[model samples]
Target: GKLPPYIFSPIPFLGHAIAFGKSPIEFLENAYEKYGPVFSFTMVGKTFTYLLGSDAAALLFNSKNEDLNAEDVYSRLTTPVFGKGVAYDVPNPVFLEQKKMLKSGLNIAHFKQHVSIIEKETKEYFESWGESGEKNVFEALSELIILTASHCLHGKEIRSQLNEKVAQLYADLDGGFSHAAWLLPGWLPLPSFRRRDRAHREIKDIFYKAIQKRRQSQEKIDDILQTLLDATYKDGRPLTDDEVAGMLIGLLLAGQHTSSTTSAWMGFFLARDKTLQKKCYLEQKTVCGENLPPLTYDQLKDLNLLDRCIKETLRLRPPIMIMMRMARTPQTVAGYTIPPGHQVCVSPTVNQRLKDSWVERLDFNPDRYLQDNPASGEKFAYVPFGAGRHRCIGENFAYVQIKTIWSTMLRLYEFDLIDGYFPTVNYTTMIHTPENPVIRYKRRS
Candidate 1:
């Protein structure tokens, strides 16, 4: 085919952004049904082509850096916030090298410590609820994920140093991930961009002092911060302070948004379905002890029901909606030729929901994992974390963090939907978030 079928709209310049924005999920579903496996539509005045279904997605997962370029699309949104010398700001080879270094912090040994760290963090955070009533479970988990990550991955100094001003700086920097930021130049003197740059400057200084202190101190620590400090490149060159600072910021932001949202949805889903909730709670008894001792890293793996619930939650409600790459060259995916200048797209939300590939697709059925594993059949069929070489780096940590948080909470409390009410998806945010995510709870033990 010469090009994918273009989803026409009434407006010429605004194009389909309004249409997509109004109802993104359904709009894609409608387009998929009519346009077949591939479709091109204009959004934000640019050509956006979608690769639907696993077969279509194979092109994206298998495409080379020379063909489908990720940095071209995401660098604008990420670079200003994290600054230079790391992440999408670097060359692909350098970014891959940095990825290898990041993996050092995410070692197997780290998971063991992470389990206890997250468990304790979850318990202590919830202990503030004062026996509970209705709480914004999403907002609560959002704060707790950072605390656990700081204590578990960034070390105690960061956890203690995370005061209100530091939190606001992060929020200011995060505000840079706007629709305009992605579409426009990052260096613009827009308020969000300026604040993002200022925050980046201050945070870098914070990291510089922390790095020097850890370097000079006789005492040593084992965490992602220390791991980045210890990381060296292929030619025996160690990561510079600037590189470490940017990478640490990247690591923290990456896990925070996705994990917290997923954890919240998992809570909502668990709340709506008491049987499934109790099943997961009881599974811990079998995996741990009847008394349910604290979850170990080894025991986390054995909690299959809990794992599936998380998997099912991700499939149903992936935090990241779309993964896009710029077509550096003409590429054929599912017989459609996506030329350079088109944004090659794959939606984890849409792909995971494609009706033909999945059974009981609309239902919240975690048991589907047992009958058929997502990894076994079509490779890109399960795409919450993405696929192939560019797959998300912190996937294992997410599972560990999520599992430990829930496992700890399950033993401490029982969650329920407020008056049998379930939350709807908030479509405004780039990441799909639960709308007004309040859940009721009663203390356990």
Candidate 2:
């Protein structure tokens, strides 16, 4: 179980550089085959202990360790991208309060309200697709999820103005965090710095004006802005406009990034499999029943094929491949003592593909999620959104949002790959994305 001295030493940053520049999936698989499940790697001057197998992932993720803080990880990696106020400075009570309010905002009633928003936005986006040939699905979904989050979080009117700006801000933030430059101590002049600066300015200005407008207006909108406006900290004091904007920025970060990646992966899976695509189309047709409008919340429960497709997508290419946790105190797992302050990483992607979970771990099959099969194994075997109390609060909303986008697209068009097009998986911080994959679509006759 001992690694070579080279892996633990201060080698050139070649592994990290190559992982970023080339195919991440292939590189990681190669590493696992060569180094085994747990090994040491240094990237950007940080030594991380990575666990690749599902069993290890489950054990690490489910461990009740307050030391494992995702906000710390996000803040350190994303400060340059989203700016200082965007990531929590410290684990404030507002973090939990914000999560609660966000959760409450996604309950049954609020989700039902967003159904119309999803349908209308999908129609509007598809109309612009305009008989497309090889569109960037990642960009397309990024725009759509931004619009969807707009309506869900900030209401329609504010969403209309803020949606485009927030979308661009997300792009800037994503770009800013792509390289190790974010980890540097000194101020460096880079294009990503300009993007982040512009994004921060645009986002702050837009949200500032919107907050003032919302405050002056008499109308009571049931949205996240309104929720933040109403929510108080543990001290029972109302959130300031700045505080509200900070939470909105965090929500925007959460909503835009994960949904975009998941949506693109869903499209990628469908593009790769024609027969499964037809099955999804058929399900949309039958469930909606001839000439029916877009799917409703009640109807979404019956979207079995769509559900299978999205679940299968998550299994194959989880939006988050690696989740990091740090141990606060010494703990023993599988007879190995993990010292305090050691970083533990879990990969759901590696686990979900384990030979024990599926007969064909590498095959593209949605039927694995059929009523009987259900991809059953360990409770934590297939955690795409993560686990424990810190599990993603917006997960249910994301599922509904993903289903809406995929079902709507499948109903309206038949998508196919551009010739000789295959997207290699890329990593931008935590999320897994296809490297600018392109696909074309034709409206069904």
Candidate 3:
């Protein structure tokens, strides 16, 4: 008969906005401690019911689309950047079909091809770093992932078009997909909106031209772009150039932020712990051999210790901190009634760090994933890539790409955090990036 406990804020309409914005995980954790697993808070005039822990994750992830729709919660923010009739803009069935087609591009054969491309790109990028110097890890990793994603996911045709000017266009486009967009309407005459619209149109034109050239030339390519161009819906209608282009933009955006940030964090953690770094390096050396050959898909998987390190890094600092779903119809979760039109929110940060879910929850110990580790037995307790139907399709792709980058770097070079500096999390962006992440490196030879 009564509502769930609400987190009261002194400022009306700005309810919990400042605190939540400052650090969502800490804010939510404090709220959960005081008010229990389920509570309500307002941010930017919108009320969100915060659901914490593993049960909350199961409920949010397993709910039917009719009851809790992710698209409805994200469409306005995503549509302007990704374009129409794709990603969160389309119906769930249509989105599912698109994901299936995208998956086809990411199958084993494609991943094999991707491994070569990623290895080549990673090797080339690191070579350009030249012997030894200090560099911002976040900036370096971001550029590397963008180039790799362009080459592997979009194919050579799209990759060729990504020159400096065009890459800046991407920066502008990325500038548009932000938390601020969540609070502000896209139609606003703000400078950010204008830049976003401009970037979207330019990027779309690039994809459109590439699509037309592929059609006119009648030459087939083995990449996601070609796959999308050839795909048709269940109704047998081919995807339009706009639709295909939109999907490409969406895919690129989705993979870039998460992968780059995770990769940067991997460097951050490894640099701080020389012992762990040596262990990971030894694992690579044994699995990859002294020659340090260009790793294959299978070889990447064999780097079990490195994989555990990655898993542990993600457990501590997941890229996407908060995931949202809109309650399409009134629903109940953890015995609390969520009203229709309310936004149901889950924090992977809070979920992954639950005391009951993980042992030594705050420590950065990758061995937690080892067979002998008791915490490894818990299910849904480690969800850096998320879960259920909406779980990232690029999970394997991310691991392979990340492993390749790290393996190449670990073999070719050794790095140190500048002055033993430890970077803090920069929560301003969609993904968690290190603030001023500087690292010094030297050639392994």
Candidate 4:
């Protein structure tokens, strides 16, 4: 009632920043152990209230957007990477409208084609890797993700491929998402900031001209680009090139970041377990028939073994580790009143791994997913794609993209860990991806 108990910190203004930064999940777990679910701590100059576990997490997931504001917390982090007059830079209703238009494009019909598109992209990408070798799984999938997403979502205008400079620009823009970018003030002359701005400008120019090019061309195409071009507000105002370009960046990044990370981790999980990897490969044959055919949306849905592996990977290594919203008004959760000045956060990364909530929680047993799933009925207990009104729209597409990519891959190669080197989590950037994710592979005869 008297504001959730503050985690004690030795330093005054700096307050618990070090403890939280060095390892948030560990610090929060200890805080949850001592403070009982709801707690507060300071980072930099800001106070944050954390809602751990299902009972605590449900409050943030279920709250009115007005009460726990997402834009306020994310705009500073998102506006530069996503550009102006779109996404977090725009009004919530407009953002929601932009979101709706993109949603219209990512449908079941589009998804059906996306399976083949993604599978084809995977085959081409791995063809460059030859018959057998050690390769960086994360890096490979990272580029492959952009390729498939660009081809499927951005449409042909983007060249359906990222050239050397284009891909590098995207990497620079993505690098802007590091903690330094979020914590540091803009215009303070950081090279990272400079590259980020340049990348945003150059990348926006590519999309801007592509949008104009599409408008001039007589040929019709279906994708988010065209969908956004045709979209209008309830008041009949059409989205401008600026808004559409920004929307493209936002939509593309969601896949580029989360889906890629989840996918690479999914591969490692299968590689680490030989039996599970074979099971996944066998399921491919079973679902597509013994001869194996190009992945279909229906078949992807039925590859239950591979599906559980992706599900389990996200549970173990959720990309957007900390999902936060600024508290616009006072909030009550489990008898603790979260003050308006605080940012309330929930972590799927922390929630899924709670020792008490999950049996064999640290183990990569997809079989656990078959069981009761350790109180999955709790709603927020397993939130890799997240929950509520702001739930990720790309979820269904992510499944298809990852499923197709892996399906094609399992058919192409037998993957094993390099010297049994399963990667640890890389936490430097906003998204938590695997570190040193090299896998040993050989072509299937």
Candidate 5:
């Protein structure tokens, strides 16, 4: 491997410490500028060779063999929250086989049912808010999406009274993924650790009860939880209750946070660009009408403009800032060798914003994704939900959920950024989220 004229502390762990202290995105950019596409850096007690741009990243993401298993990286981070066997350690073939089950859960039949759920849940959530002069959009969606995911994806009655506690638990679990805690062992009883444990206990209590109740009931609700319940292992044996709970928890964690952050970005981009906002409004008005009645699956299918809006938002501000991989053996990428045991990160944010095609890569431009000039997100490019083996199984489901929320909101309300709003980007843990991304929305009428 060709190394650059390296300039940093040679100390092993301290380099990782300093790297974690700095912005993960900025560090990649700096290394890319200095050492071309492939370069090595240390973070979180490991050395990583970050692969930049779509060309370099596609090789890793699209490989046929399980050379780059996402489970390897994800397992390390989620093992504590999802339990040992659930994350990476528990050698359960069920986890790998789960993709098929999860895929089935997101099929056309499931989405058709989900539209009704979204409408009912959204109406219920908005009604609870009553009439407000203006409401914080992120805060509102945080609660709304969690409730929708918990109630609609899981059964309503199962998680009926657990919304507030579940919301707190989600926050505590999220806080544990902060960059500062990535290196520490999960059992350490720091403030964040304590909060996470309490939250985990709360979540487990609700889920365990739900699993038991579902098992006891003769009738089954047609939801994701039911899908897991119906899922069988390689043998004919049905998934045990604990396995079902683990998969549900993993899906909920991934689904809730990514969709919420993306929803916020959709609003941020729309509010910042008035032209796009007006276009979105006109589309909603033409198809669904001004009164914004409850949408059916057929009605949602006609929302071509809404799809483009979400696509563009995903391109510009992908929720997952960086994805990591550790090479089991030395591999060559983009004329550079990545030695075994070196961590590799592929950044979607940088890949999709290439200046080769777009005049200004940084601007909020949704029209780039229109039919005439469909943004050909290069293979392994524009990874809002990741790509390749173990790529997010919920990618399509995420789009539907995000689209439902965006379309529902845009049809009825207009959002505005708080005055002098300057959002700081934070790659706290697994995903990239904005800090203090505040907005206010008013009724369209």
Candidate 6:
């Protein structure tokens, strides 16, 4: 069988590395146009087969774990951050069980309990901002999401410890999660690598202490931490302290940038368009009514306009721009053969913006998600949370958290992008974030 066409790279070994590093979406768009949906490119001494469009998306996502493995592609990056014997570092069966344990804690009942915690955290964070002020939208949302996630997922002890000092430790830890390290060895004596290891050790110690304290106490907590503590494998072995700590850190770090970046984009878009902002505000008003009562999980679901806005935000600025897999065995996709040991990739960022997949692909229109829209019916055309077995387990939790934060802010304040400015996307990080975004807000009378 003949393989897919190769994308020309002028540089040797580096092979389009500069192009991909600069702007992945642009590079993909160009490749898709010239080479069609199936093409291969080499970068940093590795070859990646690029699959574009919904058909390719379905094929890649639905491929069997044996033929196309995510762990093979992500282990290098995730192992050091999440530690060993968990996530991508372990066998597929073990990883699946770990994911299942985590999923058990993210049920509807847990979300219902999380709503008030999220609302309270958002309100308290806003109180610290005073009546009106200018703030970096990215930084603000990062802080808010971390606090809310800790309060709801890590229990009160972790939430209470989320002070400035601890936040800096998190920053140092995050500094080590670099795109460069994803391709290269993470054990190099780079400053970022050293900081990452130190922060990981410190954070792991904190979690270990907490676990020990919980074991000594008789009181029961209803958070993810407790769920993890109680979780046992199919063989009846309980999770180790290190495994629990690693999983907790992985969960937090996974959602941290994605949620923060999404919220920042949501704020930026809403600030730029008052009509859309008004629509979201009106939807919240209708849902909450006068003298706004605390929102229930069901009530948050009823905020359809706000929901659509979030959907639109995800469509436009998907934090995880690229999804990757490695071919453990040679496979045929879209009539093109993919060689064994080659990496396979799909770009939601590029796919969502394809001219054929969407009408006015560059525009920010939430109405595109309306039930009657034909484009909305396309399978795998709008998979911001991904699809199939590897889909994000925290999808619902993320929505609840974002809705809680956005709804609370929209009702209490009117936000404006400073000087009507819009920030460009920063792709250097694992998640695409707005670069130096600023938004000013005035408390509603």
Clashes of each: 0, 1, 0, 0, 1, 0
Please list the residue runs of candidate 4 whose C-alpha ends up more than 4 Å from where it truly belongs after superposition.
none
Q: Write the per-residue lDDT of candidate 2 for residues 1-445, one digit (tens) a residue.
A: 3232125433565447445345555655666777666655666555566666655555576666365556556566655444454345546454666567656666787788777688778888888778756688887888888888877777765676854556667677666555544455427666677777677667767788989888888978777677767767668877777666766776767678788888888887798797789888887878877775767889989888788888888888887777777666665544455565556667778767766555688787888766444256456666787765548888788888888878888877898877747676775455777887788788866
Give model 6 RMSD, 1 decimal.
1.4
Show model 5 residue runs off by greater than 4 Å.
1-12, 16-21, 64-66, 69-72, 90-93, 128-134, 289-291, 371-374, 420-422, 427-430
User: What TM-scores do the predictions have?
Assistant: 0.97, 0.89, 0.97, 0.97, 0.90, 0.97
Ten-residue segment with the worst summed lDDT in candidate 4? 369-378
Candidate 3 segments whose C-alpha is farther than 4 A from its true place: 372-376
Tell me the whole-model lDDT of each prediction, alpha carbons only. 0.85, 0.70, 0.83, 0.84, 0.70, 0.85
Kindly provide the TM-score of model 4 when superposed on the true structure, using C-alpha atoms: 0.97
Residues 114-189 of candidate 6 have per-residue lDDT tens digits of 9999988888888877788888889989999989998888888888877898888887777766765776586578
Cα lDDT tens digits, model 4, 1-445, are 5788887778888888767667877888888888888878887778888888888998989987789889999888799889888888888777777778778878888888888888888898889898899998888899999899988888877955469789888888888888776678786778999899989999998888888889898988777677778877767988789888888888887789788888899898898899999988888878788989777888877988888888899898998888889998888988888889798988888899998778777899988867777536577888887887758888899888888898899999999888877898765657877888898898876
Query: How well does candidate 3 score on lDDT at residue 339?
Result: 81
Cand. 5 TM to true fold: 0.90
| Candidate 6, poorest ten consecutive residues by summed lDDT | 369-378
Runs in model 6 deviating more than 4 A are: none
Candidate 4 vs candidate 5, TM-score winner: 4
Question: Tens digits of per-residue lDDT for model 3 on 1-445?
Answer: 3566777778887787777768878888888889998888877677788788777667787888888899888898889989998888889889888888877778787888898898889888887788999888888888889999999988888888888888788878888878668877766789989988999998999888988888786666677887777778878999899998888888888888788888888898898888999888888778778777788887877898998888888888899887899987777777777887778888878888877657788788888766554334644566777777668888988988898888888887887778888788887777778988888888776
Tell me the tens digit of each residue's lDDT in model 1 across 367-441: 887886554688898899998866889999999999999998888888888977788888877777789888889
RMSD of 1: 1.4
